[PDB]
Amino acid sequence: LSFQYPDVYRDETAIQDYHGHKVCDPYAWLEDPDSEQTKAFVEAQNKITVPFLEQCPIRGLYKERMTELYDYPKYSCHFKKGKRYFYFYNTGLQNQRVLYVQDSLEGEARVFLDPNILSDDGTVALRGYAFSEDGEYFAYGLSASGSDWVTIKFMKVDGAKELPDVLERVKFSCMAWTHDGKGMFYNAYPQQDGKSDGTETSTNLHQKLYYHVLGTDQSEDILCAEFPDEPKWMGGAELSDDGRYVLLSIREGCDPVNRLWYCDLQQESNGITGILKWVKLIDNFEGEYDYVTNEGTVFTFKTNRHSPNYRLINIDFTDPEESKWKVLVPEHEKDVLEWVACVRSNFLVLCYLHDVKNTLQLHDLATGALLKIFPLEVGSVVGYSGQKKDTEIFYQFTSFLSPGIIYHCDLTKEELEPRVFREVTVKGIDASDYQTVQIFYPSKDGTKIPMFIVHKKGIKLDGSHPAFLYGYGGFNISITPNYSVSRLIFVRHMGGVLAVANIRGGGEYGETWHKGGILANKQNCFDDFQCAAEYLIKEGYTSPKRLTINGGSNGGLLVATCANQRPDLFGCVIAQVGVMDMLKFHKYTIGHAWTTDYGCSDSKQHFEWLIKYSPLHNVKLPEADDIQYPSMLLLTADHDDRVVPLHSLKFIATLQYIVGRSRKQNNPLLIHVDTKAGHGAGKPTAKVIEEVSDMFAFIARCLNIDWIP
Ligand SMILES: O=C([C@@H]1CCCN1C(=O)CCn1c(=O)c(-c2ccccc2)nc2ccccc21)N1CCCC1
């Protein structure tokens, strides 16, 4: 290390008692983001990382090459609202993609909403939008500097006229227009004392559901639902297809379960004037209920009640008893039913997950019968468009070496032959030169975990190639095939191997796959992931010295632990906006919501699981002498209100102090706190290119790999 680590004050009086257990958190002052102490800390760390990163001549190689390979047309699915068609498009290197509008699939598209002119650095992103039933009015949310907070503004679709309406203090909101098109449903939070730009760590409780009449001030919005008894509950709302019913999904935590109330708008004496006459249909968190469509009083939902892999059921609001429910499409024994859409009045589009791959089939609404099976190569379905009134669908398909293909299908045709609408090609990369392979490796307990492997055709397995292993594991999130130029460059001009392990904790094999990697079995996640590395090492794909593991958010927690538990298995480690303090993660912003996957330190029983793997409280110098901690780069941003950066700070301070101080430790323990960025969504192209070029530079310079022109 040509640089020396900063002097961080250790508050040895900061001791807490956790059910008889006393834990010392000396860097607990970093929890205050506005302090002079913290500010001087972040700066101090950035003072030694930037150079380190910018000193390696491979960064500019990467950065420049990324800019070229990443310079390709990126479109989204076409979707029709009212009588117009819409689609997001990005000429290539635009910071934020733009929303286009055309009065006809053959008409001439025209800019509708360019968020690019709202910020010189593209740090103002669109976060959620909702057209009106007539497609004549449009409301969208904007986020500044990757912050979760949102401001909802409105626009008149014809002439793109901007309206005065504006809604503030919005977060994790729904946007449901009533069909009389007079107002929209949305959620807001109470006025809390202090900042509210995404730099605060304050808790978010008491979310309410309001109603905004178009043309009025938010001071007048109507309060339609609140659970003053249950601070952590979050009620989201949507309107049934026929627009006669307001369906309310009440949630608590990030579990695939929700309560479902409802309100017959025709039973409201004077429209919407306040708390609605809710009918508690499902008053429990036993299962999830995802509204698909409804014919009269028979509502069809995607549920996982007694169906770990999900299924379709029908409820008649007039015959509510669970007993009377009917099963439309039985749960599958192996395939997970991801999402469902109703198009052309009586067609249902079921999107299944088959061994981590996506399959699309058309079923009959009335019977559930399978009608057509849309042919798909290996990869995922990243976009879809088709509502109950539409007579055609669109779906974008992506893969590891496929930038994306947008298909189109006219449902008003005897022969349901789907055609290719748009096919984006990325010149400079020859898909025919790389090969994808899906293997199932056994974990510590004998469970088989799937893994995707992408490498050059013909590489000899001598354990000489750099390897990039990615995993998340948790919150029912499925890690499916996706395009990543930045990753392919790794394989191209760095000769490495890419690997994605669909370890437990995810929803690849239904909830039973989620529950086998959460709460008391969270260790399973780590073991699954560790075994993944062992596999690449054994099969000679790579080596502990040249293997890099990556992970963001709950995924960063994964790699952080995997280093604390087996630092001899990895050579490099890059944790992105990760959760490190498993003891008090629930005290900040939206962290309480995750207790359903990790547990809560406030509970004696939960503490025993958490204290065993909590990254912050488990850093330890290897006992061996020929073993040290893998070079690690932590990445976070000051506006990340999702996983407050206090997690990365207190963790870098500890890594540098406990380990960084030893003499046997040569590998750098660094951290990078980006400005004007948040958890990740809405990150402008510019910053994305800066970021990736930083990770692979770190990896290059850290493992000493050469560039391959
Ligand atoms: O980021 C996370 C976790 C896991 C998945 C998303 N997540 C979050 O907690 C996502 C936050 N979140 C939302 O954003 C919305 C929402 C719905 C509609 C529109 C806008 C928002 N609804 C939620 C309902 C319950 C709990 C959390 C919710 N983590 C980081 C660390 C591990 C958990």
XYZ file of C-alpha atoms and ligand atoms in Angstrom:
742
model
C 0.000 0.000 0.000
C 1.565 3.243 -1.225
C -1.094 4.993 0.854
C -1.838 4.944 4.585
C -5.312 4.556 6.058
C -6.936 7.483 7.925
C -7.125 7.853 11.692
C -10.664 7.040 12.762
C -11.734 7.792 16.319
C -12.830 4.679 18.188
C -15.517 5.438 20.756
C -14.776 2.662 23.246
C -17.652 3.827 25.439
C -20.255 2.983 22.817
C -21.425 -0.313 24.294
C -24.918 -1.792 23.997
C -26.632 -4.742 25.688
C -28.415 -7.264 23.458
C -30.167 -9.804 25.662
C -27.211 -10.165 28.004
C -24.798 -9.851 25.080
C -22.729 -6.659 25.032
C -21.465 -5.458 21.663
C -19.100 -2.550 21.053
C -19.789 -0.280 18.077
C -16.963 2.347 18.285
C -17.667 3.799 14.849
C -21.303 4.470 15.751
C -20.791 8.194 15.302
C -20.639 7.695 11.543
C -24.367 7.173 11.859
C -24.741 10.951 11.770
C -24.290 12.043 8.170
C -24.214 15.843 8.704
C -21.514 15.824 11.367
C -18.123 17.383 10.660
C -16.639 14.128 11.873
C -18.409 12.019 9.256
C -18.008 14.485 6.385
C -14.269 14.601 7.127
C -14.306 10.806 7.176
C -15.937 10.290 3.784
C -13.583 12.844 2.254
C -10.532 11.268 3.890
C -11.390 7.859 2.400
C -12.140 9.207 -1.075
C -8.757 10.918 -0.893
C -6.977 7.555 -1.060
C -9.335 5.613 -3.335
C -9.801 7.897 -6.322
C -6.016 8.039 -6.929
C -5.556 4.309 -6.418
C -8.290 3.771 -9.022
C -7.196 6.515 -11.441
C -3.569 5.433 -11.199
C -4.203 2.167 -13.041
C -3.874 2.710 -16.834
C -6.528 0.047 -17.399
C -9.337 2.259 -16.122
C -9.186 4.588 -19.117
C -8.920 1.601 -21.414
C -12.082 0.159 -19.902
C -13.882 3.512 -19.606
C -13.297 4.342 -23.255
C -14.145 0.842 -24.494
C -17.270 0.716 -22.376
C -18.388 4.005 -23.924
C -18.107 2.484 -27.378
C -19.654 -0.935 -26.749
C -22.354 0.612 -24.573
C -23.231 3.049 -27.358
C -26.207 1.210 -28.862
C -29.939 1.977 -29.287
C -31.921 0.953 -26.220
C -35.697 0.829 -26.660
C -38.451 -0.428 -24.417
C -41.722 -2.113 -25.341
C -44.319 -0.160 -27.263
C -47.486 0.327 -25.208
C -50.771 1.943 -26.154
C -52.570 4.394 -23.917
C -55.779 5.887 -25.201
C -55.370 6.120 -28.964
C -51.630 6.751 -28.889
C -48.597 4.488 -28.693
C -45.660 5.092 -26.372
C -42.158 3.785 -25.832
C -38.968 4.765 -24.035
C -35.906 5.020 -26.252
C -32.256 5.916 -25.685
C -30.221 6.920 -28.749
C -27.321 5.248 -26.975
C -25.383 7.338 -24.463
C -28.154 9.563 -23.163
C -28.019 9.894 -19.381
C -31.728 9.128 -19.032
C -33.911 7.452 -21.652
C -36.713 9.460 -23.316
C -40.447 8.742 -23.670
C -41.710 8.957 -27.253
C -45.246 9.283 -28.564
C -46.897 8.477 -31.892
C -50.510 8.566 -33.028
C -49.829 5.394 -35.002
C -47.403 2.470 -35.167
C -46.544 3.901 -38.591
C -46.790 7.513 -37.499
C -43.810 9.702 -36.663
C -42.693 9.419 -33.037
C -42.061 12.627 -31.117
C -40.439 13.418 -27.769
C -43.034 13.369 -24.980
C -40.834 13.498 -21.882
C -37.084 14.090 -21.844
C -35.869 14.065 -18.211
C -32.439 14.932 -19.592
C -33.164 18.658 -19.658
C -34.035 18.742 -15.947
C -30.466 18.252 -14.801
C -27.108 19.052 -16.382
C -25.778 15.771 -14.935
C -28.805 13.530 -15.455
C -29.394 13.002 -11.760
C -33.125 13.675 -12.038
C -34.834 10.471 -13.072
C -38.379 9.400 -13.840
C -39.634 7.074 -11.093
C -42.997 5.587 -11.990
C -45.750 6.879 -14.257
C -49.476 6.364 -14.690
C -51.705 7.365 -17.581
C -55.437 7.894 -17.211
C -57.959 5.411 -18.550
C -58.525 7.635 -21.575
C -54.791 8.111 -21.989
C -55.525 11.830 -22.069
C -53.805 12.694 -18.795
C -50.468 11.553 -17.417
C -48.792 11.684 -14.011
C -45.141 10.910 -13.347
C -42.774 10.831 -10.429
C -39.327 12.367 -10.410
C -36.392 11.523 -8.130
C -33.318 13.705 -7.529
C -29.902 12.133 -6.988
C -31.053 8.514 -6.814
C -33.222 9.323 -3.792
C -36.272 7.137 -3.140
C -38.354 10.200 -2.322
C -40.557 11.377 -5.179
C -42.464 14.386 -6.550
C -45.460 13.637 -8.736
C -46.142 16.069 -11.530
C -48.835 15.878 -14.218
C -49.012 16.446 -17.970
C -51.706 16.833 -20.601
C -50.929 14.184 -23.191
C -52.147 16.326 -26.104
C -49.573 19.029 -26.673
C -47.651 17.744 -23.693
C -48.974 20.630 -21.625
C -47.544 20.746 -18.116
C -50.132 21.173 -15.350
C -49.800 22.998 -11.993
C -50.577 19.891 -9.962
C -47.660 18.674 -7.836
C -47.444 16.141 -5.005
C -44.583 16.094 -2.495
C -43.507 13.826 0.374
C -44.207 10.806 -1.819
C -42.359 7.518 -1.421
C -43.130 3.932 -2.299
C -46.347 5.147 -3.879
C -48.963 3.770 -6.199
C -50.472 5.851 -8.967
C -54.046 4.795 -9.624
C -56.315 7.027 -11.660
C -60.049 6.493 -11.179
C -61.836 5.935 -14.490
C -64.009 9.008 -14.163
C -60.516 10.422 -14.665
C -61.038 13.122 -12.061
C -58.252 12.150 -9.708
C -55.522 9.697 -8.806
C -54.654 7.520 -5.806
C -51.152 7.813 -4.392
C -49.316 7.358 -1.055
C -47.520 10.057 0.942
C -45.692 10.251 4.248
C -46.193 12.599 7.225
C -44.240 15.832 7.626
C -41.186 14.768 9.617
C -38.818 17.252 11.251
C -35.493 17.502 9.439
C -34.201 16.868 5.916
C -36.042 14.760 3.356
C -33.728 14.602 0.351
C -32.395 11.100 0.859
C -29.488 12.015 3.129
C -31.538 11.590 6.304
C -31.651 8.241 8.124
C -35.015 8.847 9.799
C -37.523 5.996 9.867
C -40.464 5.902 7.460
C -43.680 4.961 9.227
C -47.350 5.872 8.969
C -47.698 5.888 5.207
C -51.163 6.949 4.122
C -53.237 6.621 0.976
C -54.619 9.916 -0.335
C -56.684 10.974 -3.341
C -55.691 13.896 -5.547
C -58.437 15.617 -7.455
C -56.880 17.045 -10.597
C -56.704 20.824 -10.494
C -56.446 21.220 -6.710
C -53.674 21.659 -4.139
C -52.244 18.684 -2.249
C -53.445 20.363 0.957
C -56.863 19.261 -0.205
C -56.060 15.664 -1.174
C -58.529 13.252 0.462
C -57.313 10.754 3.079
C -58.743 7.372 2.042
C -56.913 4.960 4.334
C -54.583 4.862 7.315
C -53.558 2.279 9.888
C -52.532 4.447 12.899
C -52.437 1.222 14.879
C -49.956 -0.421 12.506
C -47.143 2.091 11.755
C -45.299 -0.251 9.388
C -48.276 -1.122 7.156
C -48.303 0.149 3.582
C -51.538 0.150 1.602
C -51.186 0.296 -2.148
C -54.245 0.667 -4.373
C -55.365 -0.045 -7.913
C -58.682 0.002 -9.768
C -60.296 -3.110 -11.219
C -60.425 -3.223 -15.016
C -64.061 -2.097 -15.151
C -62.974 0.721 -12.846
C -65.791 0.019 -10.418
C -63.594 -1.374 -7.658
C -60.659 0.023 -5.692
C -58.441 -2.909 -4.690
C -56.254 -2.245 -1.657
C -53.110 -4.295 -1.107
C -51.949 -3.825 2.475
C -48.367 -4.868 3.162
C -45.864 -5.230 5.980
C -42.357 -6.303 5.122
C -41.044 -7.610 1.811
C -42.786 -10.962 1.956
C -44.922 -12.356 -0.882
C -48.024 -11.916 1.244
C -50.658 -9.228 1.568
C -54.084 -8.377 2.966
C -56.659 -7.396 0.370
C -59.521 -5.005 1.083
C -61.799 -3.433 -1.517
C -64.301 -0.657 -2.082
C -67.224 -0.633 -4.479
C -66.996 2.929 -5.776
C -70.696 2.638 -6.645
C -71.445 2.149 -2.939
C -69.868 5.430 -1.909
C -72.722 7.846 -1.217
C -70.981 10.886 -2.736
C -67.977 9.576 -4.604
C -64.670 9.878 -2.788
C -64.933 12.196 0.206
C -62.792 10.418 2.803
C -62.134 7.037 4.417
C -63.823 4.550 2.090
C -66.269 1.760 2.985
C -63.566 -0.913 2.765
C -64.641 -4.561 2.753
C -61.931 -6.672 4.389
C -61.904 -9.517 1.894
C -58.571 -11.009 2.971
C -57.594 -9.817 6.451
C -54.346 -11.731 6.986
C -50.805 -12.131 5.728
C -51.022 -15.859 4.990
C -50.667 -15.442 1.248
C -50.175 -12.924 -1.530
C -53.025 -11.917 -3.851
C -52.082 -10.306 -7.158
C -55.032 -8.909 -9.140
C -55.069 -10.090 -12.761
C -58.561 -9.240 -14.067
C -62.257 -9.492 -13.164
C -65.550 -10.351 -14.875
C -68.333 -8.799 -12.855
C -67.856 -9.965 -9.248
C -65.539 -12.866 -10.085
C -61.992 -11.616 -9.522
C -59.017 -13.650 -10.766
C -55.786 -13.393 -8.680
C -52.217 -14.779 -8.811
C -51.718 -16.239 -5.335
C -49.139 -18.277 -3.458
C -51.585 -19.379 -0.772
C -50.867 -23.070 -0.321
C -49.035 -22.675 -3.614
C -45.301 -22.061 -3.072
C -44.963 -21.830 -6.841
C -48.056 -19.687 -7.340
C -51.264 -20.283 -9.231
C -54.450 -18.611 -10.477
C -57.652 -18.622 -8.491
C -61.071 -17.054 -8.757
C -63.025 -15.381 -6.009
C -66.575 -14.163 -6.209
C -67.029 -11.146 -3.985
C -70.578 -12.449 -3.498
C -69.314 -15.891 -2.380
C -66.144 -14.831 -0.444
C -65.556 -18.090 1.477
C -62.116 -19.561 0.722
C -63.925 -22.864 0.450
C -65.807 -21.659 -2.659
C -62.715 -20.376 -4.471
C -61.988 -21.978 -7.821
C -58.558 -22.815 -9.237
C -58.140 -21.567 -12.818
C -54.548 -22.637 -13.514
C -53.180 -25.135 -10.943
C -49.780 -24.412 -9.420
C -46.972 -26.154 -11.267
C -44.774 -28.771 -9.638
C -41.559 -27.073 -10.753
C -42.358 -23.872 -12.607
C -42.923 -20.572 -10.799
C -45.691 -18.341 -12.162
C -43.906 -14.952 -12.183
C -46.497 -12.564 -13.612
C -49.841 -12.639 -15.406
C -51.559 -10.228 -17.785
C -55.050 -10.208 -19.278
C -55.236 -9.067 -22.901
C -57.997 -9.141 -25.511
C -60.774 -9.465 -22.928
C -60.436 -13.231 -22.588
C -56.752 -14.080 -23.012
C -54.253 -14.579 -20.223
C -50.509 -14.292 -20.702
C -48.664 -16.460 -18.160
C -44.950 -15.893 -17.778
C -43.265 -18.834 -16.091
C -39.769 -19.296 -14.711
C -38.369 -22.622 -15.898
C -34.972 -23.462 -14.430
C -34.189 -19.761 -14.284
C -35.394 -19.246 -17.844
C -38.585 -17.459 -18.915
C -41.430 -19.068 -20.850
C -44.463 -17.215 -22.228
C -47.788 -18.942 -22.879
C -51.311 -17.858 -23.768
C -54.175 -19.298 -21.755
C -57.947 -18.970 -21.951
C -59.539 -16.722 -19.337
C -62.765 -18.724 -19.023
C -61.211 -22.180 -18.673
C -57.499 -21.649 -18.098
C -56.635 -23.973 -20.968
C -53.250 -23.481 -22.584
C -53.696 -22.081 -26.090
C -50.309 -21.019 -27.406
C -46.733 -21.298 -26.242
C -44.575 -18.444 -27.489
C -41.104 -19.702 -28.576
C -38.244 -18.215 -26.567
C -34.515 -18.925 -26.574
C -32.731 -18.990 -23.218
C -32.997 -15.770 -21.239
C -35.616 -13.546 -19.623
C -38.616 -11.478 -20.629
C -37.690 -7.932 -19.527
C -40.732 -6.070 -20.825
C -44.350 -6.630 -21.749
C -47.291 -4.585 -22.947
C -50.925 -5.568 -23.308
C -53.966 -4.630 -21.258
C -57.474 -6.128 -21.204
C -58.584 -3.742 -23.967
C -55.522 -4.229 -26.207
C -55.644 -6.565 -29.207
C -51.903 -7.090 -29.414
C -48.957 -7.702 -27.126
C -45.300 -6.796 -27.034
C -42.502 -8.334 -24.999
C -38.781 -7.713 -24.944
C -36.525 -10.716 -24.530
C -32.969 -10.435 -23.258
C -30.123 -12.833 -22.526
C -26.411 -12.893 -21.671
C -25.207 -12.310 -25.236
C -28.442 -10.826 -26.578
C -28.963 -7.032 -26.148
C -32.694 -7.541 -26.480
C -35.360 -8.516 -29.003
C -38.808 -6.913 -29.074
C -41.484 -9.252 -30.420
C -44.991 -8.350 -31.527
C -48.181 -10.348 -31.756
C -51.531 -9.398 -33.301
C -54.094 -11.307 -31.201
C -56.948 -10.609 -33.641
C -55.591 -13.190 -36.058
C -56.591 -16.797 -36.597
C -52.918 -17.788 -36.618
C -51.242 -16.302 -33.548
C -47.898 -15.921 -35.314
C -45.591 -13.586 -33.359
C -43.173 -11.513 -35.426
C -39.952 -9.678 -34.614
C -40.601 -5.977 -34.163
C -37.154 -4.696 -33.271
C -33.771 -6.333 -32.905
C -30.937 -4.330 -31.400
C -27.423 -5.439 -32.284
C -24.214 -4.536 -30.481
C -21.398 -4.533 -33.020
C -17.990 -5.186 -31.522
C -19.176 -8.290 -29.710
C -19.569 -11.639 -31.444
C -22.130 -13.719 -29.561
C -20.830 -16.687 -31.556
C -17.476 -16.395 -29.772
C -18.828 -16.908 -26.257
C -20.897 -19.729 -24.805
C -23.405 -19.960 -21.974
C -23.708 -23.111 -19.823
C -26.087 -23.881 -16.962
C -24.843 -26.329 -14.382
C -26.294 -27.410 -11.062
C -23.740 -27.695 -8.282
C -24.386 -29.226 -4.842
C -24.261 -27.055 -1.730
C -23.120 -27.835 1.822
C -26.345 -29.699 2.659
C -26.679 -31.450 -0.676
C -29.129 -29.063 -2.298
C -28.493 -28.419 -5.956
C -27.940 -24.787 -6.835
C -28.096 -23.626 -10.482
C -25.317 -21.524 -11.961
C -24.877 -19.736 -15.252
C -21.427 -19.693 -16.802
C -20.400 -17.397 -19.657
C -16.906 -17.679 -21.119
C -14.972 -17.689 -24.399
C -15.351 -20.750 -26.633
C -12.384 -23.097 -26.297
C -10.815 -21.900 -23.045
C -8.752 -24.600 -21.345
C -9.756 -25.279 -17.750
C -6.390 -24.906 -16.013
C -7.628 -22.581 -13.269
C -5.757 -19.699 -14.902
C -8.597 -17.338 -15.789
C -9.968 -14.445 -13.734
C -13.509 -15.198 -12.597
C -16.402 -12.875 -11.797
C -18.977 -14.542 -9.528
C -22.293 -12.751 -8.946
C -25.134 -13.539 -6.537
C -27.876 -11.832 -4.442
C -29.878 -14.408 -2.459
C -32.889 -13.018 -0.648
C -36.206 -11.205 -0.863
C -37.620 -13.585 -3.462
C -35.526 -11.841 -6.108
C -34.743 -14.051 -9.106
C -31.389 -13.482 -10.803
C -32.209 -14.260 -14.443
C -30.277 -13.813 -17.736
C -29.564 -10.219 -18.694
C -27.258 -8.250 -20.998
C -24.219 -6.501 -19.551
C -21.681 -5.048 -21.970
C -19.526 -4.085 -18.990
C -19.390 -7.732 -17.960
C -18.671 -9.015 -21.463
C -15.737 -6.614 -21.679
C -14.407 -8.470 -18.670
C -14.544 -11.705 -20.675
C -13.281 -9.997 -23.808
C -10.387 -7.685 -22.977
C -9.631 -9.316 -19.613
C -10.064 -12.961 -20.524
C -12.290 -13.805 -17.589
C -15.227 -16.035 -16.748
C -18.630 -14.747 -15.666
C -20.800 -16.709 -13.252
C -24.212 -16.079 -11.682
C -25.254 -18.432 -8.881
C -28.947 -18.609 -8.148
C -28.411 -19.443 -4.504
C -31.219 -19.882 -1.993
C -33.037 -16.855 -0.626
C -34.331 -16.058 -4.062
C -37.526 -17.043 -5.777
C -36.025 -19.143 -8.544
C -37.739 -22.277 -7.280
C -40.757 -20.740 -5.601
C -41.076 -19.467 -2.041
C -39.761 -22.752 -0.713
C -36.519 -21.446 -2.245
C -36.962 -18.096 -0.532
C -37.578 -19.577 2.941
C -34.508 -21.818 2.654
C -32.255 -18.797 2.737
C -33.877 -16.443 5.208
C -34.284 -15.828 8.919
C -32.765 -18.811 10.762
C -31.390 -20.357 7.554
C -29.694 -17.267 6.235
C -26.436 -19.147 6.527
C -27.660 -21.389 3.735
C -27.299 -18.408 1.404
C -23.615 -17.990 2.216
C -22.873 -21.701 2.048
C -24.632 -21.902 -1.319
C -22.531 -19.021 -2.600
C -19.279 -20.275 -1.084
C -19.814 -23.684 -2.718
C -20.320 -21.847 -6.007
C -16.758 -20.554 -5.801
C -15.396 -23.920 -4.719
C -17.008 -25.338 -7.848
C -15.334 -22.847 -10.235
C -12.056 -23.503 -8.465
C -12.334 -27.293 -8.514
C -13.495 -27.518 -12.111
C -10.476 -25.362 -12.898
C -12.458 -22.385 -14.175
C -10.450 -20.004 -11.989
C -8.506 -19.752 -8.722
C -8.864 -18.225 -5.248
C -6.159 -15.714 -6.180
C -7.944 -14.516 -9.330
C -11.610 -14.833 -8.339
C -13.826 -11.827 -7.710
C -17.235 -11.875 -6.066
C -19.716 -9.029 -6.522
C -23.056 -8.150 -5.000
C -25.289 -5.178 -4.368
C -27.730 -4.414 -1.570
C -28.724 -7.669 0.095
C -26.166 -9.056 -2.342
C -23.424 -6.904 -0.853
C -24.237 -8.407 2.539
C -23.632 -11.779 0.906
C -20.135 -11.028 -0.350
C -19.235 -9.118 2.823
C -19.957 -12.204 4.958
C -18.391 -14.582 2.465
C -15.170 -12.640 3.030
C -15.443 -12.692 6.819
C -16.033 -16.457 6.654
C -13.638 -17.623 3.939
C -11.147 -14.933 2.958
C -8.951 -17.683 1.534
C -11.492 -18.485 -1.142
C -11.559 -15.053 -2.757
C -8.876 -12.765 -4.115
C -11.042 -9.709 -4.742
C -14.352 -8.491 -3.329
C -16.628 -5.664 -4.492
C -19.646 -4.873 -2.302
C -22.133 -2.367 -3.720
C -24.484 -0.363 -1.485
C -24.619 -3.234 1.002
C -26.243 -3.935 4.372
C -23.474 -4.468 6.925
C -24.928 -3.658 10.324
C -27.327 -6.557 10.856
C -27.888 -5.402 14.429
C -29.616 -2.060 13.782
C -30.413 -2.103 10.047
C -34.108 -1.713 10.973
C -33.674 1.633 12.715
C -33.143 3.581 9.502
C -35.416 4.682 6.659
C -37.160 1.664 5.144
C -35.086 -0.988 6.939
C -37.909 -2.293 9.125
C -39.442 -3.728 5.983
C -36.606 -6.265 5.727
C -37.146 -7.915 9.117
C -39.194 -10.541 7.291
C -35.994 -11.860 5.607
C -33.359 -11.278 8.350
C -35.236 -10.972 11.610
C -34.946 -8.292 14.271
C -32.198 -7.812 16.854
C -34.917 -6.645 19.249
C -35.726 -10.339 19.610
C -33.484 -12.573 21.711
C -33.912 -15.477 19.286
C -33.243 -13.432 16.154
C -30.144 -11.905 17.699
C -28.480 -15.329 17.817
C -28.727 -15.692 14.020
C -27.721 -12.116 13.237
C -24.727 -11.799 15.564
C -23.253 -14.881 13.910
C -23.043 -13.426 10.383
C -23.430 -9.655 10.801
C -20.529 -8.311 8.657
C -19.710 -5.360 10.933
C -19.485 -7.519 14.072
C -17.553 -10.377 12.567
C -14.430 -8.908 10.969
C -11.450 -10.932 12.177
C -7.777 -11.316 11.228
C -7.118 -14.761 9.694
C -5.435 -17.090 12.179
C -3.121 -18.545 9.545
C -0.090 -16.510 8.490
C -0.211 -17.236 4.761
C -3.815 -16.041 4.639
C -5.129 -12.477 4.541
C -8.334 -10.626 3.608
C -9.173 -10.292 -0.104
C -8.690 -6.862 -1.691
C -12.044 -5.170 -1.072
C -13.768 -2.186 -2.623
C -16.951 -0.865 -0.997
C -19.251 1.346 -3.055
C -21.962 3.636 -1.764
C -23.495 7.089 -2.273
C -24.609 9.884 0.045
C -28.176 9.971 -1.262
C -28.836 6.251 -0.900
C -31.852 6.403 1.407
C -32.535 2.730 0.780
C -29.518 1.269 2.540
C -28.071 4.267 4.390
C -24.297 4.469 3.727
C -23.642 4.448 7.460
C -23.493 0.701 6.853
C -20.449 0.944 4.565
C -18.652 3.579 6.621
C -18.717 1.753 9.949
C -17.658 -1.331 8.020
C -14.722 0.169 6.189
C -13.475 1.718 9.428
C -13.537 -1.736 11.013
C -11.935 -3.499 8.047
C -9.080 -1.019 8.033
C -8.576 -1.096 11.788
C -8.856 -4.796 12.606
C -7.341 -6.124 9.405
C -5.877 -3.159 7.551
C -3.427 -2.602 10.418
C -1.801 -6.052 10.342
C 1.499 -6.347 8.488
C 0.560 -9.529 6.629
C -2.273 -7.602 4.973
C -1.254 -6.128 1.620
C -4.573 -6.129 -0.261
C -6.291 -2.728 -0.095
C -9.468 -2.237 1.908
C -11.083 0.736 0.154
C -14.416 2.563 -0.089
C -15.926 5.014 -2.597
C -18.734 7.386 -1.616
C -20.215 8.885 -4.760
C -22.021 12.216 -4.662
C -25.523 12.853 -6.007
C -26.247 9.144 -6.333
C -28.543 6.814 -4.479
C -29.297 3.147 -4.226
C -28.975 2.670 -7.982
C -32.247 3.189 -9.813
C -32.219 6.213 -12.088
C -28.408 6.395 -12.223
C -27.450 8.427 -15.330
C -25.440 6.733 -18.060
C -22.419 8.911 -17.260
C -22.205 7.673 -13.665
C -22.842 4.084 -14.725
C -19.827 4.146 -17.018
C -17.759 5.772 -14.283
C -18.801 3.136 -11.778
C -18.182 -0.025 -13.794
C -14.821 1.315 -15.004
C -13.911 1.697 -11.320
C -14.804 -1.861 -10.331
C -12.935 -3.524 -13.166
C -9.995 -1.188 -12.756
C -9.809 -2.136 -9.081
C -10.009 -5.792 -10.136
C -7.403 -5.329 -12.850
C -4.929 -3.424 -10.723
C -5.607 -5.727 -7.761
C -5.099 -9.061 -9.545
C -2.561 -7.563 -11.950
C -4.348 -8.786 -15.083
C -3.388 -7.482 -18.519
C -5.612 -5.935 -21.175
C -6.404 -7.885 -24.333
C -6.910 -5.517 -27.291
O -33.949 -2.656 -1.345
C -34.147 -3.573 -0.547
C -35.500 -4.257 -0.467
C -35.490 -5.636 -1.137
C -36.264 -5.469 -2.448
C -36.670 -4.025 -2.579
N -36.525 -3.518 -1.204
C -37.218 -2.523 -0.627
O -37.450 -2.510 0.581
C -38.206 -1.930 -1.610
C -39.088 -0.928 -0.872
N -40.508 -1.042 -1.155
C -41.007 -0.373 -2.300
O -40.214 0.283 -3.013
C -42.496 -0.506 -2.567
C -43.011 0.208 -3.772
C -44.176 -0.252 -4.424
C -44.662 0.423 -5.552
C -43.991 1.559 -6.045
C -42.834 2.019 -5.405
C -42.342 1.350 -4.275
N -43.299 -1.205 -1.792
C -42.771 -1.857 -0.669
C -43.646 -2.610 0.161
C -43.159 -3.270 1.285
C -41.799 -3.207 1.616
C -40.910 -2.481 0.830
C -41.367 -1.791 -0.330
N -33.190 -4.031 0.271
C -31.804 -3.540 0.336
C -31.161 -4.440 1.359
C -32.009 -5.663 1.438
C -33.419 -5.135 1.201
